[PDB]
């Protein structure tokens, strides 16, 4: 919140107060929290009616330090998911000179909620045991038309991990994020196309066209009409089956049953099959492309401009070949001939409306010839082309309906919301800041600096070094959970369940799915993530070069622990453990925004720990820096990516060191802190250098002692900002010597990105659009960093710390409002009771059927011999169930 | 490292008044009062008292 | 755990504390949680790859004694089951010159858990008493499909013994592990293909192909199409029957009944049948071969390459011939013609898909001609060829079906986990270490030394001496229980039950079986087993020559009792009595890992006891040693296979003498122990010889008294490691004269096996991959062994034991261990604010782990 008087900044909460862990439960951050402030919309409304094409800026009056008032000043939204692939130069569209951004994931099995066999599987085992008294081969009922021997094999040897569903739901949310772009322009912000290319102006008159494998440069059309994997460079295989017996022996252990709860629609069922095939294979299967009509700043030149979505570049390794087992239409003997097999399909697979070339060409609408016993030749298709043909037909409303049918088998609300959080964390991206004196700056068009970019975590994104397909693989950026086919098979049929797998009474998905407003919201959810990470890095004074080398440094020992505990590299009792200091950022988010991040569970010996997206990053990336006006790098600062008005205008509570400078009000303007706060001024041998009041330990260190670093003090950081915010500071040593790190040209600070204005807008003035809170303190070689003024330049600021004088600073002219976290149809009121009881019954539906053990017992030869009597089912202990105990 | 008491330093000395030379090995044994020092302990303390 | 500081090694537990009995029940230590220690690992240069093909290795940053940092250095996983039969030399595959490894086993009988009669049997014998079974008709049969006269005559047997299922399930699991190699190349880590042949690179493009009797050299083919058993040669015999009346005399006592439950176990009843037959006959029947495409280290010379699985060579059972009684689907009198017998059966037995030659050739899919009461001739098939036919069709998913069916019929949980333990203990295998001053080393290509290998038990494995079929004098390794046919038949037909015969759900079958990761998990389970043995052979200083001769040729009484008590002995009935000191090794396992080994029932005279794989080895073996470069045998050391980092980084707790050195240049860097604790130095300055502070002598200063050996003292062993880790140690005796044992070339210590690097990886530096903990103390002659330095070389280390100096050694920068700056400008002790913010949430984890 913005301070109105110095009394408000002086009474702001300390940083340690906000990093305490909190116990209360909290609602999710939906992004409407920002929408109420930066837009007209007050209640639910048609996105097309609202023209949210023009709702993409912070706006407001600004006050200058000289006493003039600027009206209709603006600041751009920092994030976007679009990477320009053609760029404007000299008012003419031209191709990109820079290689594309890429992301890599770590994917592994981990323990989840403990799992248990259902009543129905106890039924199946009873059927086998009662059969054993006979000469007859029919062991058990064949569930949902699948072969009874297959139910017999699926119902055996369960894993103790539990099941996750995370990678699946990620692939589905990445694709939803990509197709969301395809709606009309009135519902997408202009700013999203010009976060990187600030010289282009998108036209409102046509919707953007999403396509596949089209890019002009660097071999980014991964085969074109003859598709191959963007990373592997190969091609997959996909084969369909009625029974497991036809699956080749080399890969019968990898097969996946396709549940018939999906495919229940009158239409779009073959499409549902293609989509389910997409959610369990490797991603990306192709490079998607957004194409939008755009024009020059004058609106003269016009053309189709090419963009690559970030979601289409992030790699999630999975299976390349796969085998799906289609539901049977009626219980029957397995087919021995082709016609018997084709006639027997519930949904018969076919190619989508888009022809492909190469070996095994696919015609649009082409049907598959089912595999069967005694078949002369095994049949299969390349998978990259099968996913290619349907790729242009997927859209948001169908993914919503699919996901809604999926909802009725298993819980998918929280899991999807978590995978969506991960989507937003890996996809929204901002360009690096430029230093300046004034309010705006940008790098040269079609330059390496223009396109260099960063995560909400202040880490730079790696680039490709060669033409697609990529011969080699980048270090992983983040670790996600995998979904095992075996336990998937057990759960899809009702043989097993766990607390995270329970169907939910809503029978419905998160609000973000199926909306045309989704891109705007995802763009707005990245903001809090950066606010929390920047508070994390700016609470301490380490410079970007020192982070950049911290992991291996042996100059200091504390810097190493500091780097090492910010990432996830610990495990215990077979499962993943969250980064030890990511919990601090998680704590900060809750205390500052009064909301709760989405989390998954991990079981450690049976105890549940929560893991948010903050705790799962991996070491190896480079930290964000800022460039000079000429494009030279600047190392001296703490990492930064966004201007601090975003931090301080969208919080309920903020640490004291980061607050805004208060408005002029008659005599009183700005104020500092002195020896009455326990601070002290630093002087050296040189009489023409002065540094502010600082912590008392600062007098007795020029190098930090090994095993120790700079402390949290909010007031000293405050005076550090007051010194920097004068236009003439020196970033120096205890003795007044130059530090090893590169420093900006004098008096400059990093500032936010420039975008073209609308009529009536003004550019931001002075330091009203700049990071300020990045006060350096820890040099790479272990020296302290000081901010010096000359004596004459020193007098007014020191008296201002003494509160005898006043400093003059610019501010936004804005008030504080932070909203509370917060529909029945007539038909819903008509049916509310029946919905209330049926929803309650579905929660226990599990593998349940009305028949009890007491009925089935009457049908048995011997009740005592039944495995259900001698082994009643229990939840599995972790990591392993007891085996061969000492009697 | 010597201030930090994880190393020793080397300086010259006078061998006077109960100060003895140190061997390069230092093969320490169990702490052991010598029998002659116990035979003469009282007569020695009497001097200090005087 | 590795040590960040010397305070961590002072506070480590004593060996005796860890050898102490613990009473609580503990969980099994599966490879599914051992897996995560290799993945999820500190280090920033690491490209954290997902494929299990690449998660094959121990990666990490390292720190030199000189203060330099090394990124992403590598240590290989020591074990494998594959044995190369083609060897690359000169960048090309070349036929191998070395003979195949072999394993052998002895049977025992199982009196534990004697059976209890059902009500059914008791009423049948009751009817035999009140009648003469005269009520029954010629054609009466049960629903199962056997006639009543047979069940009645089987009922009449009285058995002392319980039922075991062990040898059965063991054969099933060995075959499982062989078939588990057939999955795609991404699913098996490549390090497994190059533990022996380290000049070879497996290709990720194609799956390994599993065949049989295709070996290049040494008669390995086993006669090809006509299959003869690899041990002893000759064909077996197999026959099928509807009644036991038709089985020939002198074989009637040995017949097995096949329950319909075996036949309905899988979609193809013939496959389930052959699987049962293989399960209850002698193993191996043939030699399976794994073929994998490989390429040159430069990638220049690709080709197919042959490997022989270790499971394929273990020898178990002896039942060359058998008779199977099969259910009749109709209620009929016993057959008199051939066609009646054919029509009569529940499913007629058939040959498998792959045809074979011989005096009795079998066409593919050929149908057996059933036996009947008229006997123009008895009819029969060769058994090795009958199994050669079905050998290709066995598959891990179907085995998962089969195990589920067995679990329903009788509980398979406990028994299968124990059998799996024996499978790991017998098949997993590591090469003997070579000595070096530096980080990496290996023996010459296609050398005999390249192929010497050992168990997790640190016993060297036997090698074949002649071409197959073998006619060897047997050299067995361990005892196993056998499954008895009559006790089988009493249970298959409802005539008896036991306490361990409780039926189970199919869901409870252990998750390893039928899973494609299992091979990988196998290797992992070998690592903890060794650690335990390693801590047993190291706490005492006995050398490898002394272990080679204690049982066969040494006049010292103490070694004799020593080698004698480490192994098991027989009872008057012939039952096992478990190894006395083996109980110590079990204890170690449970204190270092907080996990338990499988337990198996045993009895002495009618007294319950248990047995683990730790207590069932046979006395009379040869021990692990190491090779100098150029391959000369050296045997001064106590036996060793694997590097210290493996022992140190997987344990929850280790004994004090085995802790890792702290990083160089810190306050509280490596140190030693002195008199105050209780030690005393030996000097020999007349000859330039100084030895560390050691244990006070007890009339065993130069020769040990007959009937006594060196005492357990953790701190002297530690000081001995300090003297050793210095560059030029010298192993001499009390006078400073040469010991009888062969010694390493000066300065050398045994070190881990070399493997080819991935790009961006580094070879380990210094003694970071060395084994250090094996310090000699007791020679074959009975004299003490001393580690000496010269009087000058020995001056700093004495000051470090005396705690007035620090020493410098290399380390791994893992798991909370950080680098030390050369200055060390200490400040006031200061808890960091982030550590106080996160203290509780951190302790919660430890508590959750403590629960488990």
For the residues of C404-473, what is the DSSP string, one character each? HHHHHHS--HHHHHHHHHHHHHHH-BEEPPEEESSS-B-PPTT-TTTS-EE-TTSBBPEE--SPSSB-PP
Whole-number Å distance between alpha carbons of C659 and A479: 32
Q: Where are the beta strands (DSSP E) in A190-326?
A: 201-202, 209-212, 237-241, 256-257, 288-295, 302-309, 314-315, 321-325
Inter-chain touch C598–A131, beta carbons under 8 Å: no
Whole-number Å distance between alpha carbons of C604 and C613: 18
Inter-chain touch B4–C690, beta carbons under 8 Å: no
In A568-725, alpha helices (H) = 582-593, 644-648, 714-724
Inter-chain touch B25–C802, beta carbons under 8 Å: no
Q: Which of A16, A135, A868 sits opposite C346 (nearest CB)?
A: A135
A789: tokens are: 């003024």
CB A660 within 8 A of CB A3: yes
CA-to-CA dists, residue C506 to C160, C411, C754, angstroms:
30, 9, 44
Strands A237-241 and A321-325: parallel
Whole-number Å distance between alpha carbons of C11 and B39: 41
Whole-number Å distance between alpha carbons of C527 and C77: 9
- Collect all residues with Cβ–Cβ distance below 8 Å to C231 and sequence separation of at least 6: C284, C315, C469, C470, C472
* Cα end-to-end span (Å), chain A: 66
Strands C288-295 and C209-212: antiparallel
CB atoms under 10 Å from CB of A862, counted, come to 11
Inter-chain touch B25–C690, beta carbons under 8 Å: yes
Q: Which residues in chain C touch residue A19, judged by CB atoms under 8 angstroms apart?
A: 837
Which contiguous run of DSSP H or E holds residue C845? helix C839-851
CB C62 within 8 A of CB C439: no
Q: Kindly report the backbone phi and psi dihedral angles of residue C658, in degrees, each rounded to the nearest multiple of 5, phi listed first.
A: -110, 5
DSSP category for residue A448: H
A609: tokens are: 């720990």
Q: Three-state SS for A515? A: coil
Inter-chain touch C852–A604, beta carbons under 8 Å: yes
C-alpha Rg value of chain B to the nearest Å: 16
Q: Which residues in chain C touch residue B25, judged by CB atoms under 8 angstroms apart?
A: 683, 690, 791, 794-795, 798
Inter-chain touch A880–C30, beta carbons under 8 Å: yes
Determine the Cα angle at A720 with ends A750 and A778, to 5°.
80
Whole-number Å distance between alpha carbons of C141 and C331: 6
Burial (CB < 10 A; 0-12, 13-18, 19+), residue A178, is: buried
CA-to-CA dists, residue C745 to A756, C432, C434, C731, angstroms:
77, 17, 12, 11
Whole-number Å distance between alpha carbons of C717 and C699: 20
Quickly list DSSP for A145-157: GS-HHHHHHHTS-
Q: How many Cβ contacts (< 8 angstroms) between chains A and C?
A: 289
- Collect all residues with Cβ–Cβ distance below 8 Å to A234 and sequence separation of at least 6: A228, A320
Peptide bond connecting A284 to the previous residue in cis, omega within 30 degrees of 0 = yes
C625: tokens are: 């040693």
CA nearest C167: which of C213, C236, C113, C110?
C110
Q: How much helix, strand and coil, in percent to the nearest 5, is found in chain B? A: 30, 0, 70
In A156-279, alpha helices (H) = 166-179, 269-278
Q: Which residues in chain A touch residue C825, judged by CB atoms under 8 angstroms apart?
A: 703, 705-706
Q: Count the helices and strands in chain A (H runs, E runs).
A: 24, 32
Whole-number Å distance between alpha carbons of A623 and A600: 27
Place of tokens 């014998």: C125
Quickly list DSSP for C661-683: PPPTTSSS-S----TTTT-EEEE
Burial (CB < 10 A; 0-12, 13-18, 19+), residue A513, is: buried
Whole-number Å distance between alpha carbons of C157 and C252: 13
Quickly list DSSP for A524-560: HHHHHHHHHHHHHHHTS-B-HHHHHHTTT--S-SHHH
Whole-number Å distance between alpha carbons of C744 and C731: 10
CA nearest C488: which of C410, C383, C405?
C410
Q: Which of A158, A253, A317 sits opposite C507 (nearest CB)?
A: A158
Burial readout C18-53 (b: 16 or more C-beta within 10 A, e: otherwise): bbeeeeeebbbbbbbbbbbbbbbbbbbbbbbbbebb
Which contiguous run of DSSP H or E holds residue C693? strand C689-694
A554: tokens are: 């042996």
CB A176 within 8 A of CB A151: no
Q: How much helix, strand and coil, in percent to the nearest 5, is found in chain C? A: 30, 20, 55
Peptide bond connecting A469 to the previous residue in cis, omega within 30 degrees of 0 = yes
Q: Which of C674, C690, C805 sits opposite B28 (nearest CB)?
A: C674
**What 3 state SS string does C308-357 have?**
EEHHHHECECCCCEEEEECCECCCCCCCCCHHHHHHHECCCCECCCCCEC
CB atoms under 10 Å from CB of A670, counted, come to 22
Q: Which site among C805, C808, C820 would you substitute to test the B interface, given the most B Cβ atoms closer than 10 Å to its Cβ?
A: C805
Give helix C119-130 / helix C148-155 axis angle, nearest 10°: 100
- Collect all residues with Cβ–Cβ distance below 8 Å to C23 and sequence separation of at least 6: none
CB A349 within 8 A of CB A273: yes
Strand partners, A289: A211
Whole-number Å distance between alpha carbons of A661 and A722: 9
Which contiguous run of DSSP H or E holds residue C841? helix C839-851
Q: Kindly report the backbone phi and psi dihedral angles of residue C812, in degrees, each rounded to the nearest multiple of 5, phi listed first.
A: -100, 130
- CA torsion sign for C770, C771, C773, C778 is negative
Whole-number Å distance between alpha carbons of A784 and A695: 12
Determine the Cα angle at C591 with ends C585 and C594, to 5°.
120
CA nearest A521: which of A55, A168, A182?
A55
CB A442 within 8 A of CB A753: yes
Whole-number Å distance between alpha carbons of A366 and A385: 12
CB A549 within 8 A of CB A533: no
CA nearest C478: which of C316, C610, C601?
C316
Place of tokens 């006493």: A67
Burial (CB < 10 A; 0-12, 13-18, 19+), residue C516, is: buried
Whole-number Å distance between alpha carbons of A396 and A178: 9
Whole-number Å distance between alpha carbons of A697 and C213: 79
Q: Which of C676, C804, C824 sits opposite B4 (nearest CB)?
A: C824
Q: How many Cβ contacts (< 8 angstroms) between chains B and C?
A: 36
Tell how far CA C111 is from the center of its chain: 27
What is the length of chain A?
A: 887
Q: Three-state SS for A308? A: strand
Whole-number Å distance between alpha carbons of A657 and A713: 8
A606: tokens are: 């049976």
Q: Kindly report the backbone phi and psi dihedral angles of residue C683, in degrees, each rounded to the nearest multiple of 5, phi listed first.
A: -120, 155
Q: Which residues in chain C touch residue B30, judged by CB atoms under 8 angstroms apart?
A: 675-676
Whole-number Å distance between alpha carbons of A779 and A703: 9
CA nearest C311: which of C32, C519, C31?
C519
Whole-number Å distance between alpha carbons of C585 and C425: 14
Q: Is C668 an 8 Å CB contact of chain B?
A: yes
Whole-number Å distance between alpha carbons of A640 and A656: 18
Chains C and A touch, contact meaning at least 3 pairs of CB atoms under 8 angstroms apart: yes
C-alpha Rg value of chain A to the nearest Å: 31
Whole-number Å distance between alpha carbons of C355 and C450: 38
Inter-chain touch A703–C403, beta carbons under 8 Å: no
Whole-number Å distance between alpha carbons of C441 and C755: 9
Give helix C582-592 / helix C518-538 axis angle, nearest 10°: 120
Whole-number Å distance between alpha carbons of A671 and A655: 17
- Collect all residues with Cβ–Cβ distance below 8 Å to C347 and sequence separation of at least 6: C263, C269, C270, C273, C326
Neighbours of chain C (3+ CB pairs under 8 A): A, B
CB atoms under 10 Å from CB of A608, counted, come to 15
- CA torsion sign for A13, A15, A17, A18 is positive
Quickly list DSSP for C256-285: EE--HHHHTSSSSHHHHHHHHHHHTS-B-S
C-alpha Rg value of chain C to the nearest Å: 30
Place of tokens 């295989």: A237
Give helix C31-38 / helix C518-538 axis angle, nearest 10°: 80
Whole-number Å distance between alpha carbons of A191 and A182: 16
Whole-number Å distance between alpha carbons of C119 and A597: 63
Whole-number Å distance between alpha carbons of B8 and A872: 71
Whole-number Å distance between alpha carbons of C74 and C61: 9
Whole-number Å distance between alpha carbons of C78 and C80: 7
Whole-number Å distance between alpha carbons of A317 and A236: 13
C343: tokens are: 């029509």
DSSP category for residue A333: P
Burial readout A279-297 (b: 16 or more C-beta within 10 A, e: otherwise): bbbbbbbbbbbbbbbbbbe
Place of tokens 């978590």: A418
Place of tokens 């996913």: A387
Q: Three-state SS for A751? A: strand
Q: Kindly report the backbone phi and psi dihedral angles of residue C676, in degrees, each rounded to the nearest multiple of 5, phi listed first.
A: -60, -40
Whole-number Å distance between alpha carbons of A298 and A292: 18
Whole-number Å distance between alpha carbons of C347 and C338: 15
Technique of determination: cryo-EM
C50 vs chain A: nearest CA distance in angstroms?
6
Whole-number Å distance between alpha carbons of C603 and C588: 24
Whole-number Å distance between alpha carbons of A833 and C807: 78
Whole-number Å distance between alpha carbons of C387 and C222: 14
């Amino acid at each position: 919140p913005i301070s109105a008087d110095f009394s408000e900044v002086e009474n702001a909460p300390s940083f340690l107060s906000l990093a305490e862990n909190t116990d209360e439960v909290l609602k999710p951050y939906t992004g409407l929290e920002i929408q109420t402030i930066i837009t007209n919309i007050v209640g639910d409304a048609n996105p097309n009616q609202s023209r949210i094409f023009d709702q993409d800026r912070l706006r407001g009056n600004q006050y200058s330090a000289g006493g003039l008032v600027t009206q209709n000043a603006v600041s751009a939204i920092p994030f976007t998911n679009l990477i320009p692939r053609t760029i404007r130069v000299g008012n003419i569209l031209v191709n990109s000179a820079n290689r594309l951004q890429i992301t890599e994931t770590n994917v592994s099995e981990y323990y989840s909620n403990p799992i248990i066999a259902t009543k129905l599987s106890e039924m199946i085992s009873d059927q086998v045991k009662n059969n054993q008294f006979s000469t007859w081969r029919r062991d058990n009922t064949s569930l949902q038309g699948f072969n009874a021997f297959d139910i017999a094999t699926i119902n055996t040897a369960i894993l103790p991990n539990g099941l996750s569903l995370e990678s699946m739901l990620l692939k589905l949310s990445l694709l939803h994020s990509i197709k969301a772009m395809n709606v009309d322009a009135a519902s997408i912000n202009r700013s999203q196309y010009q976060v990187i290319d600030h010289n282009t102006v998108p036209t409102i008159g046509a919707p953007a066209v999403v396509g596949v494998n089209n890019s002009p440069v660097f071999g980014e059309d991964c085969g074109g009409n003859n598709p191959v994997y963007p990373f592997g460079g190969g091609t997959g295989a996909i084969a369909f089956h009625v029974t497991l017996q036809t699956v080749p022996d080399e890969r019968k252990s990898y097969a996946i049953f396709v549940p018939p709860a999906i495919l229940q629609a009158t239409s779009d069922a073959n499409e549902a099959l293609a989509l389910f095939a997409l959610s369990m294979s490797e991603w990306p299967h192709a490079l998607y492309t957004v194409t939008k009509q755009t024009t020059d700043l004058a609106g003269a030149n016009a053309g189709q401009q090419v963009f690559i979505p970030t979601q289409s570049t992030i790699h999630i390794g999975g299976r390349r070949v796969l085998d799906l087992i289609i539901p049977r239409r009626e219980i029957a003997p397995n087919p021995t001939t082709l016609v018997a097999a084709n006639a027997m399909c519930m949904v018969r697979p076919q190619a989508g409306p888009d022809a492909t070339a190469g070996a095994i060409p696919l015609a649009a609408g082409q049907l598959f010839n089912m595999n069967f016993i005694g078949a002369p030749a095994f049949e299969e298709w390349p998978m990259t082309s099968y996913l290619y043909s349907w790729a242009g037909r997927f859209d948001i409303t169908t993914i919503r309906q699919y996901m809604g049918r999926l909802a009725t088998m298993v819980g998918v609300k929280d899991a999807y919301w978590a995978a969506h959080e991960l989507n937003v964390a890996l996809s929204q991206v901002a360009p690096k800041m430029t230093t300046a004196a004034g309010g705006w700056a940008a790098q040269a068009a079609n330059s390496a600096q223009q396109s260099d970019v960063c995560y909400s975590s202040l880490l730079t994104v790696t680039r490709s070094a060669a033409n697609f397909p990529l011969a080699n693989q980048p270090a992983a950026d983040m670790r996600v959970y995998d979904t095992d086919p075996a336990t998937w098979n057990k759960v899809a049929l009702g043989l097993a369940t766990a607390a995270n797998l329970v169907p939910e009474q809503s029978m419905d998905v998160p609000f973000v799915v199926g909306d045309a407003r989704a891109s705007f919201w995802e763009r707005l959810q990245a903001i809090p993530m950066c606010i929390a990470w920047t508070m994390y890095y700016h609470s301490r004074g380490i410079t970007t070069l020192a982070w950049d080398n911290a992991y291996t440094d042996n100059t200091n020992k504390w810097l190493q622990k500091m780097v090492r505990n910010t990432f996830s590299t610990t495990q215990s009792v077979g499962t993943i453990i969250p980064a030890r200091y990511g919990k601090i950022v998680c704590n900060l988010y809750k205390n500052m925004f009064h909301r709760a991040p989405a989390y998954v569970a991990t079981s450690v010996g049976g105890k549940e720990l929560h893991i948010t997206h903050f705790e799962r990053w991996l070491p190896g990336g480079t930290y964000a820096n800022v460039y000079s006006g000429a494009g030279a790098v600047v190392n001296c600062f703490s990492p930064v990516l966004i201007p601090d008005i975003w931090c301080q205008y969208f919080t309920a509570k903020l640490p004291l060191f980061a607050g805004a400078f208060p408005p002029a009000q008659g005599q009183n303007s700005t104020k500092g802190f002195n020896s009455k706060q326990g601070l002290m001024i630093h002087r050296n041998q040189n009489n023409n250098l002065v540094a502010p009041y600082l912590e008392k330990f600062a007098d007795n260190s020029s190098y930090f002692p090994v095993g120790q670093g700079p402390e949290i003090n909010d007031m000293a950081t405050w005076n550090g900002r007051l010194w920097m915010t004068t236009g003439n500071v020196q970033y120096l040593d205890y003795s007044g010597a130059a530090i090893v790190e590169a420093v900006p040209p004098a008096g400059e600070l990093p500032v936010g990105k420039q975008i073209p204005l609308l009529a009536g807008e003004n550019a931001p003035i002075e330091l009203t659009n700049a990071a300020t809170t990045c006060v350096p303190r820890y040099s790479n070689d272990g020296r302290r960093i000081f901010t010096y003024l000359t004596t004459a330049q020193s007098v007014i600021p020191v008296q201002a710390c003494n509160r005898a004088a006043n400093l003059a600073r610019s501010c936004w002219l804005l008030s504080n409002v932070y909203a509370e976290p917060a529909v029945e149809d007539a038909f819903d009121t008509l049916t509310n009771s029946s919905f209330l009881d049926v929803a309650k019954s579905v929660a226990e539906s599990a593998g349940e059927v009305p028949a009890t053990k007491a009925l089935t017992d009457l049908q048995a030869v011997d009740v005592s011999s039944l495995p259900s009597t001698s082994d009643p089912s229990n939840v599995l202990s972790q990591p392993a169930p007891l085996m061969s105990p000492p009697t | 490292q010597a201030c930090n008491r994880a190393a020793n330093l080397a300086r010259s000395c006078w061998l006077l008044s109960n100060v003895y030379a140190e061997p390069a090995l230092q093969a320490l044994g169990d702490e052991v009062e010598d029998a002659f020092d116990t035979l003469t302990n009282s007569s020695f303390l009497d001097v200090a008292k005087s």
